[PDB]
Amino acid sequence: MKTLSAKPAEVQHDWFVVDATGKTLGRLATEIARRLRGKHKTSYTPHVDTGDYIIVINAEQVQVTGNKALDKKYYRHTEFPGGLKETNFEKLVAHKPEEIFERAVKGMLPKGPLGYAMIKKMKVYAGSEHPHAAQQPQVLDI
Amino acid sequence: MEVTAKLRGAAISAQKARLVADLIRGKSVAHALNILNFSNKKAAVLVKKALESAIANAEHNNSLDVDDLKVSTIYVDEGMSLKRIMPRAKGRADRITKRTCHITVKVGV
Amino acid sequence: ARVKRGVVAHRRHKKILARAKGYYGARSRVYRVAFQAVIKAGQYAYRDRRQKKRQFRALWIARINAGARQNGLSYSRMIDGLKKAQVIIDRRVLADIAMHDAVAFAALAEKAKGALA
Amino acid sequence: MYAVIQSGGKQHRVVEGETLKVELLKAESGATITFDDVLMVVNGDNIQIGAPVVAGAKVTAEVIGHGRHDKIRIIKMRRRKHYRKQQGHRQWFTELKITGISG
Amino acid sequence: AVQQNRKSRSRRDMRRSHDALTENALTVDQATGETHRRHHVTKDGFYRGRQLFA
RNA sequence: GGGAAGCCUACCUCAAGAUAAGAUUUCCCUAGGACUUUAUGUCCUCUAAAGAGCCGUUCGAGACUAGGACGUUGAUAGGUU
RNA sequence: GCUAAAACUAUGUGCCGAAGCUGCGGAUGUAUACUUUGUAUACGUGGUAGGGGAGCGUUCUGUAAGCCGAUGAAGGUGUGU
RNA sequence: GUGAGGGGAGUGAAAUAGAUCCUGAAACCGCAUGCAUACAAGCAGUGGGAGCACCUUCGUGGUGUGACUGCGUACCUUUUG
Ligand SMILES: NCCC[C@H](N)CC(=O)NCCC[C@H](N)CC(=O)NCCC[C@H](N)CC(=O)N[C@@H]1[C@H](O)[C@@H](OC(N)=O)[C@@H](CO)O[C@H]1NC1=N[C@@H]2C(=O)NC[C@@H](O)[C@H]2N1
């Protein structure tokens, strides 16, 4: 037993703030998912949450390329017959910008209790302000 | 030091008797006696008999005081069953099981 | 010479049930279910003795990648640089040093990129 | 201070006084083994990484004894094919106590 | 209609998790001092002072 | 820029187990010892609030429930006029 | 999720990747030489229907008018090896 | 309840040999203690692995439990399957 696992009581979560103005959605989401899972730390352990807290500001300024702003579709199903609801990126980014980031990062995190715990460390805000000044987040330019 | 009484071969199912036993498990003897006295269950009579026997044993054989006793342990076990035949329609017969149970009551200071 | 089976049969069933301790429901009580459960456990253990080596190598590689990227290199480039530098330390020790000694890992990465240059 | 040594086709990171189990060796119990092919020596800020090996470094250990690990059951079964076989295993090891490390 | 699989003891007990009994509302009768069922005549025929059987 | 009984709203009902468990108004609880596992710590003594329920009289509420009203400072039900 | 790609075409340098190969430890089959040996070397050891070889335990007879046993047999239930 | 049943006393080497009474297994059914468990989807294990409780040669130890995680669709028969 020479290879050691990280202990949850000894994990340090650090707070970072990221500005989404002008970034490509997927290429930002991959880095966010990596840092939420803790793939950047030498104490990375698959069954332990070793990641950091990420605060995304200016969420509605995120961009997609090509014609995806009008063509990319978001679906959901109310489990009633015929209950398929559909929207697109252009409307969703104006209405609920945090849901776009939630979908993009949830699709890249593991699907299970540990993934549910991991995604709780991401805070998304439409404006340029966040309520987490008490945690003193550091600017992270990813 | 707990004092024990056993009522063996009571003509009732253990599943039914356990409902009454769980009601008085862990209570003082006076409270348990009130509960059994005002219950309308058939198993209450049998459990009250066992409890009174245990209290009498504690009083007479071990010289303990009534006021300090409580129901420290109680459980109900399955006894021997009686087998009978019930005739059904069209010449079919079913087997009937008439269940009994054993009640153990322990009282302790 | 009539032979009664009871003692030996009971011993065999009891050994199987003893090996099935801790399983849920009938898997730890009922002989048929318990016997099916023990064989499958052995099959899984045989397969996982092979899977364990791959899983631990993947863990070492991930930790080495994190350390290399902290020192300005990718995992593949750092491995190539160590190979060209003739260092033959294996991934288990490399990951151990990456986790527990940052200065030594920085020295190793410096050696690797010096060999790359 | 710690060092990296090779034993039994595998590599170990050891400090002085450490007890460790390696593959079975032919040395007698109570004898001393000298590793003269040390791959790395770290003593505080002093770091030495061998090209293949660190020239001049030595690690001395003492053989405590030999033993066998816990038993493992091997089970093979091909369902519906009337085939099944089993076997047990216990792997030998040699226990060492590190007594000296010199860069 | 009948089950395709026998129900486990755990599921049977989970169904029975609502089978517990409750206590009745008992009270000390101030006129006589004995425990009685609340709002009921005592076993000796007393209720809030009046006495039924001479 | 215009553009349909179609889409999102708009109308009605449900909705914070929305575990992201939200908001507002008002109300209640302000005691001592010992000890070590020195901490929302474990045991003694004291204290039992705002409220909730059991029970009872019942309902245009109801399978059982749940929900609504009332319990002598009372019209909750029956009776009586 | 992806648009000077995370697509396609061409070229290059690295890396990941299997129970394949190598390293370390152990078992077993066949053959050559050690001209008993139980020893080294070389080559083998996925398997249904089948064929061949070697064993473990159970009841009873002799060995046994022996040996163990109320200072505790068989059986039952745990633990260690 | 002059019932059934039990607790003492006494007999006995032994009463958990107390009358359907030697031994007293399993299915099946209780009580007690320790840990886990009410935001999470599947043959229920397996390879890892934190925490907790008891013990302790105080440990690179023992016993019980198992948060979280990679992989993973029972057995037999009959079949091309
Ligand atoms: N601390 C607690 C204190 C609590 C308090 N004190 C309360 C208390 O204590 N209550 C006690 C209640 C106990 C119980 N209720 C009483 C009870 O059961 N009475 C039973 C009364 C009648 C009894 N049925 C008769 C009986 O035994 N017939 C048998 C029978 O014909 C048969 O037997 C079997 N197997 O087929 C035969 C074969 O041998 O033998 C007979 N018999 C023989 N005997 C003889 C012997 O020994 N040698 C020689 C030969 O004569 C033998 N034959």
Contact by Cβ (8 Å): A38, A44: yes
Cα of B3 vs centre of ligand 1, distance in Å, is: 28
Q: Give the resolution value in Å.
A: 2.2
Contact by Cβ (8 Å): A137, A55: yes
Considering only alpha carbons, which residue of chain C is nearest residue E7?
Answer: C25
Q: What is the rounded CA–CA span in Å between residue C37 and residue A117?
A: 33
Where exactly are the structural domains of chain B?
A: 1-109
Residues from chain E contacting residue C25 (CB–CB below 8 Å): 8-10
Considering only alpha carbons, which residue of chain E is nearest residue C26?
Answer: E8
Q: Which two tokens stand for residue A127?
A: 């404006």
Which residue type is seen at D98? I
Q: Which residues of chain C from 27 to 86 reach within 8 Å of chain A, CB to CB?
A: 56, 59-60, 62-63, 66-67, 69-70
What DSSP character marks residue A112?
Answer: S
Three-state secondary structure readout of chain D? CEEEEEECCEEEEEECCCEEEECCCCCCCCCEEEECCCCEEEECCEEEECCCCCCCCEEEEEEEEEEECCCEEEEEEECCCCEEEEEEECCEEEEEEEEEEEC
SS3 of chain A: helix, strand, coil, percent, to 5: 35, 20, 45
Q: What is the rounded CA–CA span in Å between residue B63 and residue B89?
A: 60
Query: First vs last Cα of chain C: how many Å apart?
Result: 87
Q: What is the rounded CA–CA span in Å between residue C32 and residue C34?
A: 5
User: What is the distance in angstroms measured between the alpha-carbon CA of D83 and the sugar C1' of H81?
Assistant: 19
φ, ψ dihedrals at A69, nearest 5°: -60, -35
**Neighbouring C-beta atoms of residue A116, cutoff 10 Å:** 12
Q: What is the rounded CA–CA span in Å between residue A95 and residue A60?
A: 9
What is the number of residues in chain A?
Answer: 142
HSE-CB for D11 with a 13 A CA cutoff: 19
Q: What is the rounded CA–CA span in Å between residue B29 and residue B2?
A: 13
Q: What is the rounded CA–CA span in Å between residue D67 and residue B66?
A: 65
Residues from chain B contacting residue E19 (CB–CB below 8 Å): 19
Q: How far is CA A105 from CA A4, A118, B3, C20, C51, in A?
A: 29, 10, 66, 42, 29
Query: What approach was used to elucidate this structure?
Result: cryo-EM
Starting at the edge strand found earlier in the chain, the sheet holding D46-49 runs D10-15, D2-7, D40-43, D46-49
Contacts for A29-36: CB closer than 8 Å, 24+ residues apart: A29/A101, A29/A104, A29/A105, A29/A108, A30/A108, A31/A142, A32/A56, A32/A101, A32/A105, A32/A122, A32/A142, A33/A105, A33/A108, A33/A109, A35/A140, A35/A142, A36/A105, A36/A109, A36/A118, A36/A119, A36/A121, A36/A122
Cα of A71 vs centre of ligand 1, distance in Å, is: 96
A85 touches strand F (CB under 7 A): yes
Instruction: Report, in ranges, which bases of strand G sit under 7 Å from a protein C-beta.
Output: 1-4, 6, 14-19, 23-26, 47-49, 57-60, 75-79
Residue B102's closest CA among B38, B36, B50?
Answer: B50
Burial environment of residue C35 by CB neighbours within 10 A (0 to 12, 13 to 18, 19 or more): middle
Burial environment of residue C75 by CB neighbours within 10 A (0 to 12, 13 to 18, 19 or more): middle
Where exactly are the structural domains of chain C?
A: 1-117
Which residue type is seen at C81? G
Q: What is the rounded CA–CA span in Å between residue E46 and residue D49?
A: 100
Mention every residue, 6+ apart, whose C-beta is less than 8 A from residue C19.
C38
Cα of B76 vs centre of ligand 1, distance in Å, is: 29
Q: What is the rounded CA–CA span in Å between residue C30 and residue A118?
A: 41
Q: What is the rounded CA–CA span in Å between residue D23 and residue D93?
A: 5
Q: What is the rounded CA–CA span in Å between residue D80 and residue D96?
A: 48
What DSSP character marks residue A24?
Answer: B
Contacts for B45-49: CB closer than 8 Å, 24+ residues apart: B46/B7, B46/B10, B46/B12, B46/B17, B46/B103, B47/B17, B47/B20, B47/B21, B47/B74, B47/B103, B47/B105, B49/B7
Contact by Cβ (8 Å): A87, A114: no
Q: What is the rounded CA–CA span in Å between residue A56 and residue D55?
A: 53
Contact by Cβ (8 Å): E3, E11: no
Biggest distance spanned by C-alpha atoms of chain E: 66
φ, ψ dihedrals at C6, nearest 5°: -65, -45
Q: What is the rounded CA–CA span in Å between residue D102 and residue C46?
A: 42
Q: What is the rounded CA–CA span in Å between residue A29 and residue A61?
A: 14
Where exactly are the structural domains of chain D?
A: 1-103
Q: What is the rounded CA–CA span in Å between residue A48 and residue A31?
A: 19
Q: Is the dihedral of CA D29, D31, D35, D41 positive or negative?
A: positive
